[PDB]
Amino acid sequence: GPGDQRFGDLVFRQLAPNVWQHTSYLDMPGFGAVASNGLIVRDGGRVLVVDTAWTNDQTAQILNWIKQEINLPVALAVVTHAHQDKMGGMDALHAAGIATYANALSNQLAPQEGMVAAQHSLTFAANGWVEPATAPNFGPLKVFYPGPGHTSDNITVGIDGTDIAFGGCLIKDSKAKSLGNLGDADTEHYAASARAFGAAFPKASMIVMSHSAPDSRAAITHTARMADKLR
Ligand SMILES: [Co+2]
Ligand code: NI
Ligand code: NI
Ligand code: NI
Numbered sequence: 001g002p003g004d005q006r007f008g009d010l011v012f013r014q015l016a017p018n019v020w021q022h023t024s025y026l027d028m029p030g031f032g033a034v035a036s037n038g039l040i041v042r043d044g045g046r047v048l049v050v051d052t053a054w055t056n057d058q059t060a061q062i063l064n065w066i067k068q069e070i071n072l073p074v075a076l077a078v079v080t081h082a083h084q085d086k087m088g089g090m091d092a093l094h095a096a097g098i099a100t101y102a103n104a105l106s107n108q109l110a111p112q113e114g115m116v117a118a119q120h121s122l123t124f125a126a127n128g129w130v131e132p133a134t135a136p137n138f139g140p141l142k143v144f145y146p147g148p149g150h151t152s153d154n155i156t157v158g159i160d161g162t163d164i165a166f167g168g169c170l171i172k173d174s175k176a177k178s179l180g181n182l183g184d185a186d187t188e189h190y191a192a193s194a195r196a197f198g199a200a201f202p203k204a205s206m207i208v209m210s211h212s213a214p215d216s217r218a219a220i221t222h223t224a225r226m227a228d229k230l231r
């Protein structure tokens with residue numbers, strides 16, 4: 001094969017014939033450089049983005065990479081929760097004229113989290129699945145709210161026609177020593193949420209997450225086990 005492509009300050013790794021993982025890095029004091037992962041999906045004739053990079057400039061570099069390597073318009077972008085690593089680059093999307101979507105609760109939280117709100121709000125049915133009327137032209141993206149975990153507003157996405165499911169920062173890999181930043185976490189409902197995500201995408205084999213390489217379903221089980229210790 002061919003190695004993961006370096007473009008600007010970013011790294012792109014193709015997970016499927018129409019799916020790529022974009023990675024951006026931010027220096028955290030004494031922690032070294034921290035990677036944050038999102039996704040890029042090619043649907044027929046347009047591109048779909050999941051999550052921004054840490055910053056606007058990094059997010060602009062993503063759009064440049066798409067123009068160079070895919071050359072299709074970015075129809076929309078969905079962000080998974082109101083934290084810098086997922087919504088830090090909203091202005092870059094808006095400057096490019098891209099319709100952005102986020103959980104309604106994420107947009108509510110954006111000001112207190114110091115984030116720019118998305119332009120459109122997603123609402124989810126009682127069973128967790130997004131109400132289609134609020135998510136037009138999402139194509140293969142299946143959006144699902146598993147409940148409060150990493151944050152109160154974290155959502156997850158599965159890509160129809162693939163074995164991929166993106167858990168975002170809700171899920172950690174199968175050997176993570178902790179659930180990381182629990183500043184805005186719901187310790188009570190966390191465990192139940194990770195298990196809901198797994199049940200929502202029962203056939204997904206490649207689990208993509210924010211802070212490590214794609215893992216198996218062992219990531220879901222392992223994350224839930226760690227979450228049980230919080231309640
Ligand atoms: Co900004
Ligand atoms: Ni609009
Ligand atoms: Ni409904
Ligand atoms: Ni409860």
Ligand code: NI
Pocket residue numbers: 174175221222225
């Ligand atoms: Ni384990």
Ligand SMILES: [Zn+2]
Pocket residue numbers: 081082083150151169
């Ligand atoms: Zn977060």
